[PDB]
Design a protein around this ligand. Sequence first.
Ligand SMILES: C#CCN(C)Cc1nc(C2(O)CCNCC2)cs1
Length: 330
Amino acid sequence: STGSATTTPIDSLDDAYITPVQIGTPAQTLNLDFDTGSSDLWVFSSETTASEVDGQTIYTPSKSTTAKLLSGATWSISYGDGSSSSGDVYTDTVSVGGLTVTGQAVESAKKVSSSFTEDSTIDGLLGLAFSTLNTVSPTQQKTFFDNAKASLDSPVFTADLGYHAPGTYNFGFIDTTAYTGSITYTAVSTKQGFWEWTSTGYAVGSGTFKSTSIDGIADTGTTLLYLPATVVSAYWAQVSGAKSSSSVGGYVFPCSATLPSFTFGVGSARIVIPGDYIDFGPISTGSSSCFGGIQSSAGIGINIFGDVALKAAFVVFNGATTPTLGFASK
Ligand SMILES: C#CCN(C)Cc1nc(C2(O)CCNCC2)cs1
């Protein structure tokens, strides 16, 4: 089997991407944030605290003839931004772009933190990291990808995120028309449950390439590119007036600036992030200070190749017995 679904930015900044997901019988379509940095499929639901729902579409298991309560199973998760959610668990039929998994654990939120309530466009998350990170207790549950793997034509999914434009998640096949050149595959460590890999270095703008190992995770659920402070300082030093602002919480730059590109290494290959992809717009409406898309990872403990990096590439999440990551230019 295969599946293919379009993913769409939630706003003009590409803060996150939503993909329609069919849950239950008859189908209830929710727009979920596909997150390769976590491993829970959770949704706003009829059980979510009413004061914590503000415009989201909810999953109602009582209206699904295929829903079954997963008795005694609960879940509780926290993300890098301090957001959180928790609730009960059902199993139900879940379809993405024509690919159907029966008996998928669908984690129904009883509580969500404020950042989820405030984002009326995201109805939940669909985790695509390794199932060892799934938070369901006492019986840990498999991700949608893990459950689908045996049925897929090939045990892979691909992320082709757009720049201020829709893109595509494909399951079970590699669309050889979607990228230029070849896909360079690189080793993955699953020891922390992430799609964790090692970039071979970087360049800023037209500068020469600096060969250096940068361990990090491929995370479609993180907006920005978080890299070591040395690398990030070398990037922003090329932008007149750029500086790290403790009040804003990161590097800012004059909105009048045109930004240099940023290149990261994948083996001997190179992915070039155009400078415009690094511009996240005014810090507040009307401000002439703009927020940078490359930020320091020093406070988080891990480097994150988030959407800023991944949207410059066609990215293969290869879930073969020895998982690997592939990157192609596009
Ligand atoms: C701060 C800090 C330390 N870590 C929690 C930082 C991290 N946060 C994550 C994510 O939550 C980011 C969003 N997508 C899912 C994974 C992975 S590592």
